[PDB]
Amino acid sequence: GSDIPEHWEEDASWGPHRLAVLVPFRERFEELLVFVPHMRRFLSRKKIRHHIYVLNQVDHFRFNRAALINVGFLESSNSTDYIAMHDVDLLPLNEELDYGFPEAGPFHVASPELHPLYHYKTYVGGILLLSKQHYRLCNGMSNRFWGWGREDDEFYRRIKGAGLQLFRPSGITTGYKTFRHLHFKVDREGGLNTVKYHVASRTALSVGGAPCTVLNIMLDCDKTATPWCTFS
Ligand SMILES: O=c1ccn([C@@H]2O[C@H](COP(=O)(O)OP(=O)(O)O)[C@@H](O)[C@H]2O)c(=O)[nH]1
Ligand SMILES: [Mn+2]
């Protein structure tokens, strides 16, 4: 079923920021069906205003998460002022995870001490929140990886290079049960200001009543610069 409960309604007590949840996506139908209402629930109990954007890559190039996140940033509503780059299959179970506006610096929700798998100090993946100003300060993510290498560690380099520091949950006592987990040297130049794309369609989707926006994105690839985008 699809009724909308009361606690999904916003009021003046939720405060002033609004989160764009940017979900890069390919063939994760099953996980999405759990994810959209899970997050609507989780965030709405925490009084976090949000909109969820499923970034659906429908060109026939290799899957380029980073490039998709750049598009999500660019296509998200101007009423959102921070983003959460958020894997579709990592669900937060702990109400103390801070998905609030990360004013001091990028906030890595899925820290290695909390992730069910990954465990190294500069692991930057899974769930990462930045203010739109900070994401712009970093020039967003590299578009050049096309699924190869570690686009996340390159992002960590952009964060430090921009003068920012990274913060992580403190005082969290659940462990590898904090989340439910459902189951390359390129040029440094470019990112948010060089991503090329178009949106083939936008679709309003409700999942048991919980809304999200599906963006069907066609990324362009300059095959002379990154021929390997075709290598799929
Ligand atoms: O073929 C893919 C690859 C990944 N993703 C998205 O990118 C995230 C991270 O990719 P994946 O979980 O496959 O790798 P991991 O982050 O666990 O190393 C996923 O949670 C999805 O949101 C996707 O939807 N389809
Ligand atoms: Mn995963």
From Swiss-Prot:
This is Beta-1,4-galactosyltransferase 7. It comes from Homo sapiens (Human). Belongs to the glycosyltransferase 7 family. The chain holds residues 81 to 327 of 327 of the full protein. Glycans are attached at N78. Its EC number is 2.4.1.-, 2.4.1.133. Residues 5-232 are lumenal. UDP-alpha-D-galactose binds at residues 24-28, 63-65, 88-89, 118, 148, 181-183. N-acetyl-D-glucosamine binds at R150, E151, D152, D153. One of its GO terms (molecular function) is beta-N-acetylglucosaminylglycopeptide beta-1,4-galactosyltransferase activity. Its cofactor is Mn(2+). High expression in heart, pancreas and liver, medium in placenta and kidney, low in brain, skeletal muscle and lung. GO terms for biological process: carbohydrate metabolic process; glycosaminoglycan biosynthetic process; glycosaminoglycan metabolic process; glycosylation; negative regulation of fibroblast proliferation; protein modification process; protein N-linked glycosylation; proteoglycan biosynthetic process. It is an enzyme of class 2 (transferase). Disulfide bonds join C221-C229. GO terms for cellular component: Golgi apparatus; Golgi cisterna membrane; Golgi membrane; membrane.
